[PDB]
PDB file of C-alpha atoms in Angstrom:
ATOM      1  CA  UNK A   1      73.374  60.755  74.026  1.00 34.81           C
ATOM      2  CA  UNK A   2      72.854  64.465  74.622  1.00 36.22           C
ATOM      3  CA  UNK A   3      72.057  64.243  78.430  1.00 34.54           C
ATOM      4  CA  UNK A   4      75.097  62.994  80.043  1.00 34.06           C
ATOM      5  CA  UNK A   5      76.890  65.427  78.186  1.00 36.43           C
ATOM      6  CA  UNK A   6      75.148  68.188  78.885  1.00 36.24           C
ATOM      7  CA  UNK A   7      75.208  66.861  83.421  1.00 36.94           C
ATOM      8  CA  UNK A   8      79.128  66.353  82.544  1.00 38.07           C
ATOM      9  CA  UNK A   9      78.843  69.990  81.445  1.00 36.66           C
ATOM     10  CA  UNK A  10      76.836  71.208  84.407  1.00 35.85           C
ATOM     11  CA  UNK A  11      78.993  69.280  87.026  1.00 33.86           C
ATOM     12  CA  UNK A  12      81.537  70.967  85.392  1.00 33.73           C
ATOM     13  CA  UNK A  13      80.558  74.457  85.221  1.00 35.70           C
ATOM     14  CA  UNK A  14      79.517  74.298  88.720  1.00 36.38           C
ATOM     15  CA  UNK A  15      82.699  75.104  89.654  1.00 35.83           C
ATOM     16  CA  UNK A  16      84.236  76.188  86.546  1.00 34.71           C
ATOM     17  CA  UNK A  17      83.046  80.434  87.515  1.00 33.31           C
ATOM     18  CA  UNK A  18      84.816  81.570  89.957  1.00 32.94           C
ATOM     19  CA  UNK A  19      83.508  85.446  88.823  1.00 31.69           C
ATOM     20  CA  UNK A  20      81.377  87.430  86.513  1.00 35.03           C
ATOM     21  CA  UNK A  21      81.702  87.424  82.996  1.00 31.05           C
ATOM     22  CA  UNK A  22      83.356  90.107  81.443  1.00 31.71           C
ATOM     23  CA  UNK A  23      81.063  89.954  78.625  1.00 30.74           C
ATOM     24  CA  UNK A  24      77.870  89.510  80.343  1.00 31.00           C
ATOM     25  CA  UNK A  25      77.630  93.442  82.257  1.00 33.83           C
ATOM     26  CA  UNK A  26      75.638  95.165  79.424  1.00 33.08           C
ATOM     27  CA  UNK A  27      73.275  96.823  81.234  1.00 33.54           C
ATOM     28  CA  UNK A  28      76.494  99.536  81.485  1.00 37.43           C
ATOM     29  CA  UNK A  29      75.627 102.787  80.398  1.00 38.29           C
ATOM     30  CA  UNK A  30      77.744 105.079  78.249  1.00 38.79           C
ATOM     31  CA  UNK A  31      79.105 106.966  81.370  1.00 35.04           C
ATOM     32  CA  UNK A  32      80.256 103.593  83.527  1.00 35.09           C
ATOM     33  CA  UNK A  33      81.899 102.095  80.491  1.00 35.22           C
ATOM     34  CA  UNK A  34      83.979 105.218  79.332  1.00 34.84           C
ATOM     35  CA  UNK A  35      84.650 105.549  82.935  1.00 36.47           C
ATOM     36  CA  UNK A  36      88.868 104.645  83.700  1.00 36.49           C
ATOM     37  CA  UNK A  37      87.771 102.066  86.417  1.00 33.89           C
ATOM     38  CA  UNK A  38      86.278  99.611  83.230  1.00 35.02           C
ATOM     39  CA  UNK A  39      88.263  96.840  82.854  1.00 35.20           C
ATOM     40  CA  UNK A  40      87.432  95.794  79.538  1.00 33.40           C
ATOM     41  CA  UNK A  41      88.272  99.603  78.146  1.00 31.94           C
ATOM     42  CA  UNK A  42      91.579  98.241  77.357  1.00 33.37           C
ATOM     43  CA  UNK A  43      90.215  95.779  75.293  1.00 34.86           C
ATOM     44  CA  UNK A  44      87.877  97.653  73.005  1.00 35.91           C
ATOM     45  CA  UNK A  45      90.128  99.232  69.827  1.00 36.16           C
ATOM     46  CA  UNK A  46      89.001  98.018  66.271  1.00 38.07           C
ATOM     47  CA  UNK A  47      84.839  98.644  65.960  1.00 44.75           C
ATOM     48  CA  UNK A  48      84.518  95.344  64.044  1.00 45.51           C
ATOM     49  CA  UNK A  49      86.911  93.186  66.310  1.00 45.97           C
TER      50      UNK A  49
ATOM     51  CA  UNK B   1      91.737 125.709  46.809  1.00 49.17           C
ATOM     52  CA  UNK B   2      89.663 122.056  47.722  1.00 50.63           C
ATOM     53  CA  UNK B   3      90.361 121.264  51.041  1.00 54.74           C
ATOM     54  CA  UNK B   4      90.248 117.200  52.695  1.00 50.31           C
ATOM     55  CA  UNK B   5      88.014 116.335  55.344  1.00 47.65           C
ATOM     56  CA  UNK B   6      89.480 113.161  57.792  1.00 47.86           C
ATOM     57  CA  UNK B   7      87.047 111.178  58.718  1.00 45.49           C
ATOM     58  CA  UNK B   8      86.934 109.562  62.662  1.00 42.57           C
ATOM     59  CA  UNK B   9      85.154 106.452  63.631  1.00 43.17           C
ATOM     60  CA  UNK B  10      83.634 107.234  66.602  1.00 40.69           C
ATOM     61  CA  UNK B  11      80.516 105.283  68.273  1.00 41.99           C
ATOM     62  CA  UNK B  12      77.205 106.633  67.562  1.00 43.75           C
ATOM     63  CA  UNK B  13      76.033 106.950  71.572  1.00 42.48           C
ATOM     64  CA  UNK B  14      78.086 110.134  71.706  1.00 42.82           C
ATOM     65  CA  UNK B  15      77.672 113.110  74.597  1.00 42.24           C
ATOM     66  CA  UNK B  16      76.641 115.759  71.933  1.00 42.62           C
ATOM     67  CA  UNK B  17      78.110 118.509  74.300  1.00 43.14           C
ATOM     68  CA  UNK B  18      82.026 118.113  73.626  1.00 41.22           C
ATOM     69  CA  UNK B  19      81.464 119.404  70.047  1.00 41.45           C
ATOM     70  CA  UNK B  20      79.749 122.561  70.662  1.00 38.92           C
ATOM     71  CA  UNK B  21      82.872 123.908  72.151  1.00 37.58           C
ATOM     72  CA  UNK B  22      87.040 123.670  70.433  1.00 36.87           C
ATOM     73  CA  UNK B  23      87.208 120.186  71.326  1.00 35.54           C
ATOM     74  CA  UNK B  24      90.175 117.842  70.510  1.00 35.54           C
ATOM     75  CA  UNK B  25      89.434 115.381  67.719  1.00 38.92           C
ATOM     76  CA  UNK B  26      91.131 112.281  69.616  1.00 38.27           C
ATOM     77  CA  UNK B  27      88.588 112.225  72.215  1.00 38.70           C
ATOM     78  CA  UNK B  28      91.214 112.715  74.975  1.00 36.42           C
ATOM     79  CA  UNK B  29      92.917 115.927  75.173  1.00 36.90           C
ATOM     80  CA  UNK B  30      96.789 115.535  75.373  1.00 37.34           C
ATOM     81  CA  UNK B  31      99.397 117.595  74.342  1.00 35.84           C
ATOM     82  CA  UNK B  32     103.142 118.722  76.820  1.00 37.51           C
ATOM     83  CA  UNK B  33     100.885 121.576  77.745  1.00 39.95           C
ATOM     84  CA  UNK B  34      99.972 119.864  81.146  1.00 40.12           C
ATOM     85  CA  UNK B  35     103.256 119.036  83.212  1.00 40.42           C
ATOM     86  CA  UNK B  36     104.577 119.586  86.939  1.00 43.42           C
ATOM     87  CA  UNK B  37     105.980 116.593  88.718  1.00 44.37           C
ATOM     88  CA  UNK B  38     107.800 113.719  86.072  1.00 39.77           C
ATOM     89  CA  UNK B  39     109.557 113.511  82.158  1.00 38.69           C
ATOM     90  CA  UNK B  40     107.499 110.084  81.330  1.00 41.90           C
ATOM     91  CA  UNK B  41     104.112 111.843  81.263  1.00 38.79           C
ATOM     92  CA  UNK B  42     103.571 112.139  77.461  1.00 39.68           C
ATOM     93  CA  UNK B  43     102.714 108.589  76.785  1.00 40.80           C
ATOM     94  CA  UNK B  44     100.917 108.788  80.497  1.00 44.68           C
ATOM     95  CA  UNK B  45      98.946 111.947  79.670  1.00 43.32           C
ATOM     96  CA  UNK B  46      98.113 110.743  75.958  1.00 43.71           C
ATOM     97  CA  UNK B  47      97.835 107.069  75.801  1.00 45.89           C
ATOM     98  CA  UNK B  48      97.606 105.174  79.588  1.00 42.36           C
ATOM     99  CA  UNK B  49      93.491 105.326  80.112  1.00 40.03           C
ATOM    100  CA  UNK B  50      93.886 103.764  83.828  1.00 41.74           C
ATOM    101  CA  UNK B  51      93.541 106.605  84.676  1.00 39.22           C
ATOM    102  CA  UNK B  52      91.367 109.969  83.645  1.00 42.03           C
ATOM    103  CA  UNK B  53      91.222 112.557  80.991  1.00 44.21           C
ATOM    104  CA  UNK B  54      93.031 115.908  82.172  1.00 46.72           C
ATOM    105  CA  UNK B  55      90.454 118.700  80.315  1.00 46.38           C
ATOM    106  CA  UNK B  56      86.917 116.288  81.429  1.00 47.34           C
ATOM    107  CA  UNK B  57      88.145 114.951  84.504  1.00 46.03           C
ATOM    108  CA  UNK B  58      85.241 112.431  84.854  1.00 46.21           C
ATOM    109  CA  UNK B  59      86.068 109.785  81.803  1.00 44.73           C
ATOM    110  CA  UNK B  60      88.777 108.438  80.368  1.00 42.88           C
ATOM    111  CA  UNK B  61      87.855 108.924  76.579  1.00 45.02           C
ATOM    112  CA  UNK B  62      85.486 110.481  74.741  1.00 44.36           C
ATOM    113  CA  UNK B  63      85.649 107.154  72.210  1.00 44.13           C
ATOM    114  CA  UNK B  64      87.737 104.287  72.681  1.00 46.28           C
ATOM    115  CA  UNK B  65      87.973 103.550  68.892  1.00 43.93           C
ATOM    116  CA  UNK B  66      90.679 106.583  68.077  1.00 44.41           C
ATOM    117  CA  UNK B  67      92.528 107.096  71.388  1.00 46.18           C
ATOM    118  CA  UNK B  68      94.423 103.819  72.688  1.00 49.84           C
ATOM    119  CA  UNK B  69      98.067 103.229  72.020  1.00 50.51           C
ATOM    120  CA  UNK B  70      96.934 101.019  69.190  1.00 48.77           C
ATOM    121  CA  UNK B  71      93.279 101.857  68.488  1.00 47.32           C
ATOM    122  CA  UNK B  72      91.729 101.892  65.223  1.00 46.88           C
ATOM    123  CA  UNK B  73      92.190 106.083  64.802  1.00 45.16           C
ATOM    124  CA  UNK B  74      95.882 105.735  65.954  1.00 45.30           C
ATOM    125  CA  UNK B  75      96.742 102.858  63.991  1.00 42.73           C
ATOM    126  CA  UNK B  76      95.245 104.434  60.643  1.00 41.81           C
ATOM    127  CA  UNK B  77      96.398 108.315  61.317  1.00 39.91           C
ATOM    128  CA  UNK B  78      99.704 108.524  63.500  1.00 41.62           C
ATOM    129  CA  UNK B  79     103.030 109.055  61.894  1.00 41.26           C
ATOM    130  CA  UNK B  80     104.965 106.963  63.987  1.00 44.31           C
ATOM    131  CA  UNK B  81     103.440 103.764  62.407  1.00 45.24           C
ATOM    132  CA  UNK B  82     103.591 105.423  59.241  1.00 44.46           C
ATOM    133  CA  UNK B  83     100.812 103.725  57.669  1.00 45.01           C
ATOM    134  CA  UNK B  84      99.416 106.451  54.926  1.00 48.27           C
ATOM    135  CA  UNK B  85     103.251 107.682  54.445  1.00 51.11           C
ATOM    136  CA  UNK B  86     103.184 106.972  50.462  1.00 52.98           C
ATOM    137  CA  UNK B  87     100.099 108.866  49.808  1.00 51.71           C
ATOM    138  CA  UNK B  88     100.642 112.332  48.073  1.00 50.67           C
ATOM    139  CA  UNK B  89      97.563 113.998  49.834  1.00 50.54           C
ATOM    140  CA  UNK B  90      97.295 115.540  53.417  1.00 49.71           C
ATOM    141  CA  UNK B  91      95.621 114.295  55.934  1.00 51.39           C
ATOM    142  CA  UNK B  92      94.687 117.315  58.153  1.00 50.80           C
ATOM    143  CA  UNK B  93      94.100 115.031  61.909  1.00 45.10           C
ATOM    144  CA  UNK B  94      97.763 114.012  61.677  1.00 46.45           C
ATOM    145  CA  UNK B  95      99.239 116.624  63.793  1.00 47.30           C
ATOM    146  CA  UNK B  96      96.489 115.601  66.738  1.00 44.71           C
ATOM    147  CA  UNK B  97      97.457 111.963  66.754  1.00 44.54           C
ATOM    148  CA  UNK B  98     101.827 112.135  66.890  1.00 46.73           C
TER     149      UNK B  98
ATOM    150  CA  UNK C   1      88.489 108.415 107.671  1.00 47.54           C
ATOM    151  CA  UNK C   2      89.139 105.944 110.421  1.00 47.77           C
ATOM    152  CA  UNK C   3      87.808 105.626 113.760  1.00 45.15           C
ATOM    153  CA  UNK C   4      84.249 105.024 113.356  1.00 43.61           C
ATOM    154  CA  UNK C   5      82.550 101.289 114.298  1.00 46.70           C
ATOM    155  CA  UNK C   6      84.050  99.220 111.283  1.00 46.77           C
ATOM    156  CA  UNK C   7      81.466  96.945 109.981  1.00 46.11           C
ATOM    157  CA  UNK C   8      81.539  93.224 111.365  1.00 45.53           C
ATOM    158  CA  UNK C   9      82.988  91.676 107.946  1.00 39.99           C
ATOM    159  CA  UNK C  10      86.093  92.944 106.383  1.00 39.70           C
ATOM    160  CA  UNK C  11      84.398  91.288 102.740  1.00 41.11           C
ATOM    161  CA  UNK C  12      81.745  92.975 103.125  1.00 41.23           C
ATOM    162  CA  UNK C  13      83.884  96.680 103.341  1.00 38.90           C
ATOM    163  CA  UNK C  14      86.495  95.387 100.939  1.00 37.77           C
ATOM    164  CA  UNK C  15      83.981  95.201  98.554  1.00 40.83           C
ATOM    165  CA  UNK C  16      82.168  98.217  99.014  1.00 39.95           C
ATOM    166  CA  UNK C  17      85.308 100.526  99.105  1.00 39.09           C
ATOM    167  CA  UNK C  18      86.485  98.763  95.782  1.00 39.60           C
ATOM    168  CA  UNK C  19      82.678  99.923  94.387  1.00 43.05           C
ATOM    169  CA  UNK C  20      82.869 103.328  95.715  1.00 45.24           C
ATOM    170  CA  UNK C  21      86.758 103.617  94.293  1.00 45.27           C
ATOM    171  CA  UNK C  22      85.203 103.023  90.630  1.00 44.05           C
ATOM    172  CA  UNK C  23      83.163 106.317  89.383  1.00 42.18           C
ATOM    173  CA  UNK C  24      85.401 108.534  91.173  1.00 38.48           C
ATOM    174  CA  UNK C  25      88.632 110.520  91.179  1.00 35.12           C
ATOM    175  CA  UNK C  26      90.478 110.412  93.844  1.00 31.47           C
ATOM    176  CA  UNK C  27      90.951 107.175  96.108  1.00 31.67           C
ATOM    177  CA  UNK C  28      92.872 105.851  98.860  1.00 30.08           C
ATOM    178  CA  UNK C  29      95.740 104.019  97.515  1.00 29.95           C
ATOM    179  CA  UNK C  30      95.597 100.723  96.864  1.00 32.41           C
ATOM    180  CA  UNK C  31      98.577  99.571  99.594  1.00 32.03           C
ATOM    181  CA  UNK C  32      96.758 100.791 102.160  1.00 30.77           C
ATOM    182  CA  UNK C  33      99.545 102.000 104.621  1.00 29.24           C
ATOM    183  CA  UNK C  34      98.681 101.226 107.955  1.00 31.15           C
ATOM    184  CA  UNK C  35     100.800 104.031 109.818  1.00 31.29           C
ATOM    185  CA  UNK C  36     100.368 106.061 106.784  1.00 32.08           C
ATOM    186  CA  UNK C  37      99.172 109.858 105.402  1.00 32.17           C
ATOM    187  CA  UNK C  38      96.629 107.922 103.046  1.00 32.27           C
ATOM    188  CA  UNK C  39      97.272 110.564 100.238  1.00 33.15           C
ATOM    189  CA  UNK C  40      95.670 109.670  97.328  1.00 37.96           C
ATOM    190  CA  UNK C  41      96.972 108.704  94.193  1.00 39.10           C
ATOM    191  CA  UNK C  42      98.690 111.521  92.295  1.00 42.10           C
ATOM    192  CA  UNK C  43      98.527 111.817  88.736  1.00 39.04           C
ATOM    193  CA  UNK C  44      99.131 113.241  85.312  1.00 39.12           C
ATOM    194  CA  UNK C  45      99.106 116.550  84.317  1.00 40.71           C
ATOM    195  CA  UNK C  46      96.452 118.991  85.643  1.00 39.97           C
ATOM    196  CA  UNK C  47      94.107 120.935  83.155  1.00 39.39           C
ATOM    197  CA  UNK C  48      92.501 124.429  84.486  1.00 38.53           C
ATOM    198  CA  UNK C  49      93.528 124.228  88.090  1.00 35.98           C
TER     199      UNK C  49
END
Protein backbone atom coordinates (compact mmCIF):
# COMPACT_ATOMS: atom_id res chain seq x y z
CA UNK A 1 0.00 0.00 0.00
CA UNK A 2 2.63 2.67 -0.57
CA UNK A 3 3.51 3.30 3.17
CA UNK A 4 4.96 0.18 4.42
CA UNK A 5 7.01 0.16 1.52
CA UNK A 6 8.30 3.24 1.62
CA UNK A 7 9.16 2.55 6.21
CA UNK A 8 10.66 -0.91 4.74
CA UNK A 9 12.70 1.47 2.58
CA UNK A 10 13.62 3.91 5.33
CA UNK A 11 14.47 1.12 7.91
CA UNK A 12 16.49 0.05 5.31
CA UNK A 13 18.40 2.93 4.20
CA UNK A 14 19.07 3.79 7.69
CA UNK A 15 21.82 1.77 7.60
CA UNK A 16 22.25 1.10 4.06
CA UNK A 17 25.04 4.64 3.79
CA UNK A 18 27.82 4.00 5.28
CA UNK A 19 29.44 7.34 3.23
CA UNK A 20 28.77 10.16 0.90
CA UNK A 21 27.56 9.78 -2.40
CA UNK A 22 29.83 10.03 -5.07
CA UNK A 23 27.31 11.67 -7.12
CA UNK A 24 25.86 14.00 -4.71
CA UNK A 25 29.33 16.63 -4.21
CA UNK A 26 28.33 19.16 -6.96
CA UNK A 27 28.91 22.11 -5.35
CA UNK A 28 32.79 21.19 -6.70
CA UNK A 29 34.23 23.81 -8.60
CA UNK A 30 36.24 23.43 -11.78
CA UNK A 31 39.61 23.60 -9.84
CA UNK A 32 38.66 20.71 -6.98
CA UNK A 33 37.32 18.40 -9.62
CA UNK A 34 40.30 18.59 -12.16
CA UNK A 35 42.34 18.38 -9.11
CA UNK A 36 44.37 14.50 -9.00
CA UNK A 37 42.95 13.91 -5.42
CA UNK A 38 39.07 13.50 -7.21
CA UNK A 39 38.04 10.24 -7.06
CA UNK A 40 35.51 10.15 -9.58
CA UNK A 41 38.20 11.74 -12.30
CA UNK A 42 38.77 8.26 -13.28
CA UNK A 43 35.40 7.79 -14.07
CA UNK A 44 34.54 10.70 -16.29
CA UNK A 45 35.71 9.76 -20.22
CA UNK A 46 32.79 9.80 -22.84
CA UNK A 47 30.76 13.48 -22.45
CA UNK A 48 27.44 11.68 -23.04
CA UNK A 49 28.12 8.55 -20.75
CA UNK B 1 46.74 23.68 -50.51
CA UNK B 2 43.28 23.16 -48.01
CA UNK B 3 44.41 22.24 -44.85
CA UNK B 4 42.05 19.93 -41.96
CA UNK B 5 41.20 21.28 -38.76
CA UNK B 6 40.70 18.28 -35.77
CA UNK B 7 38.25 19.05 -33.74
CA UNK B 8 38.56 18.29 -29.55
CA UNK B 9 35.68 17.87 -27.25
CA UNK B 10 36.56 19.65 -24.46
CA UNK B 11 34.04 21.01 -21.61
CA UNK B 12 32.86 24.44 -22.01
CA UNK B 13 34.00 25.70 -18.18
CA UNK B 14 37.52 25.99 -19.55
CA UNK B 15 40.58 28.22 -17.79
CA UNK B 16 40.87 30.55 -20.90
CA UNK B 17 44.62 31.12 -19.96
CA UNK B 18 46.29 27.74 -21.28
CA UNK B 19 45.50 28.84 -24.88
CA UNK B 20 47.06 32.14 -24.99
CA UNK B 21 50.39 30.52 -24.74
CA UNK B 22 51.90 26.99 -27.13
CA UNK B 23 49.82 24.79 -25.18
CA UNK B 24 49.48 20.98 -25.79
CA UNK B 25 46.18 19.99 -27.37
CA UNK B 26 45.64 16.83 -24.96
CA UNK B 27 45.19 18.91 -22.01
CA UNK B 28 48.11 17.21 -20.20
CA UNK B 29 51.48 17.80 -21.45
CA UNK B 30 53.47 14.49 -21.96
CA UNK B 31 56.03 13.62 -24.15
CA UNK B 32 59.94 11.40 -23.04
CA UNK B 33 61.10 14.95 -22.66
CA UNK B 34 60.68 14.76 -18.77
CA UNK B 35 62.75 11.72 -17.30
CA UNK B 36 65.36 11.12 -14.34
CA UNK B 37 64.69 8.26 -12.01
CA UNK B 38 62.60 4.98 -13.87
CA UNK B 39 61.90 3.33 -17.77
CA UNK B 40 57.93 2.87 -16.96
CA UNK B 41 57.26 6.63 -16.88
CA UNK B 42 55.67 7.11 -20.36
CA UNK B 43 52.35 5.62 -19.62
CA UNK B 44 52.93 7.30 -15.89
CA UNK B 45 53.78 10.75 -17.28
CA UNK B 46 50.98 10.56 -20.11
CA UNK B 47 48.10 8.55 -18.97
CA UNK B 48 48.08 7.72 -14.82
CA UNK B 49 46.07 11.11 -13.51
CA UNK B 50 46.62 9.97 -9.66
CA UNK B 51 48.82 11.99 -9.75
CA UNK B 52 49.62 15.72 -11.35
CA UNK B 53 50.37 17.31 -14.62
CA UNK B 54 54.28 17.93 -15.04
CA UNK B 55 54.12 21.61 -17.12
CA UNK B 56 50.81 23.01 -14.54
CA UNK B 57 51.74 21.33 -11.53
CA UNK B 58 48.41 22.13 -9.76
CA UNK B 59 45.76 19.77 -11.86
CA UNK B 60 45.76 16.75 -13.30
CA UNK B 61 44.10 17.65 -16.75
CA UNK B 62 43.16 20.41 -18.45
CA UNK B 63 39.85 18.19 -19.71
CA UNK B 64 39.14 14.81 -18.77
CA UNK B 65 37.25 14.05 -22.05
CA UNK B 66 40.65 13.70 -24.39
CA UNK B 67 43.38 12.65 -21.91
CA UNK B 68 42.59 9.20 -20.03
CA UNK B 69 43.96 5.92 -21.22
CA UNK B 70 40.60 5.39 -22.85
CA UNK B 71 38.87 8.79 -22.99
CA UNK B 72 36.73 9.93 -25.67
CA UNK B 73 39.86 12.08 -27.55
CA UNK B 74 42.15 8.97 -27.16
CA UNK B 75 39.78 6.48 -28.19
CA UNK B 76 38.76 8.51 -31.47
CA UNK B 77 42.49 9.96 -32.39
CA UNK B 78 45.37 7.53 -31.16
CA UNK B 79 47.01 5.14 -33.52
CA UNK B 80 47.41 2.41 -31.31
CA UNK B 81 43.61 1.64 -31.38
CA UNK B 82 43.65 2.41 -34.87
CA UNK B 83 40.23 3.55 -35.16
CA UNK B 84 40.33 6.21 -38.29
CA UNK B 85 43.21 3.89 -39.95
CA UNK B 86 41.09 3.38 -43.36
CA UNK B 87 40.46 6.95 -43.94
CA UNK B 88 42.59 8.56 -46.80
CA UNK B 89 42.75 12.07 -45.08
CA UNK B 90 45.12 13.34 -42.24
CA UNK B 91 44.26 14.01 -39.16
CA UNK B 92 46.79 16.65 -37.93
CA UNK B 93 46.28 15.87 -33.59
CA UNK B 94 47.53 12.33 -34.24
CA UNK B 95 51.09 12.80 -33.48
CA UNK B 96 49.95 14.47 -29.85
CA UNK B 97 47.87 11.50 -28.83
CA UNK B 98 50.52 8.13 -29.70
CA UNK C 1 56.32 17.89 11.85
CA UNK C 2 55.98 15.97 15.06
CA UNK C 3 56.31 16.96 18.52
CA UNK C 4 53.70 19.41 19.10
CA UNK C 5 50.40 18.54 21.57
CA UNK C 6 48.56 15.99 19.17
CA UNK C 7 44.94 16.63 19.28
CA UNK C 8 42.83 14.38 21.77
CA UNK C 9 41.18 12.17 18.84
CA UNK C 10 43.25 10.41 16.32
CA UNK C 11 39.65 10.64 13.88
CA UNK C 12 39.52 13.78 14.24
CA UNK C 13 43.51 14.32 12.75
CA UNK C 14 43.10 11.38 10.42
CA UNK C 15 40.61 13.19 8.83
CA UNK C 16 41.94 16.47 8.63
CA UNK C 17 45.43 15.37 7.28
CA UNK C 18 43.51 13.25 4.56
CA UNK C 19 41.65 16.94 3.70
CA UNK C 20 44.75 18.89 3.75
CA UNK C 21 46.60 15.92 1.52
CA UNK C 22 43.85 16.67 -1.32
CA UNK C 23 44.59 20.24 -3.12
CA UNK C 24 48.16 19.86 -2.69
CA UNK C 25 51.43 18.49 -4.03
CA UNK C 26 53.45 17.04 -1.94
CA UNK C 27 52.26 14.79 1.11
CA UNK C 28 53.47 12.55 3.67
CA UNK C 29 53.24 9.12 2.44
CA UNK C 30 50.52 7.22 2.96
CA UNK C 31 52.44 4.24 5.22
CA UNK C 32 53.31 6.52 7.56
CA UNK C 33 56.73 5.11 8.83
CA UNK C 34 56.99 5.44 12.33
CA UNK C 35 60.95 5.51 12.66
CA UNK C 36 60.99 6.98 9.29
CA UNK C 37 62.52 10.18 7.01
CA UNK C 38 58.75 10.95 6.03
CA UNK C 39 59.92 11.94 2.44
CA UNK C 40 57.22 12.58 0.40
CA UNK C 41 56.03 10.85 -2.44
CA UNK C 42 58.29 11.12 -5.48
CA UNK C 43 57.02 11.31 -8.82
CA UNK C 44 57.04 11.57 -12.56
CA UNK C 45 59.03 13.56 -14.57
CA UNK C 46 59.82 17.19 -13.60
CA UNK C 47 58.92 20.15 -16.03
CA UNK C 48 61.07 23.58 -15.63
CA UNK C 49 62.92 22.76 -12.47
Amino acid sequence: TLDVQMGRFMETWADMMPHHPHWVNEHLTILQFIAPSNPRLRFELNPAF
Amino acid sequence: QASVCEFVAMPVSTDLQYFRTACNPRGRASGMLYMGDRDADIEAIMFDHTQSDVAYTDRATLNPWASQKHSYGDRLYNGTYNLTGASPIYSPCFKFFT
Amino acid sequence: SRGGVPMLHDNVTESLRRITASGGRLNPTEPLPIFGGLRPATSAGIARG
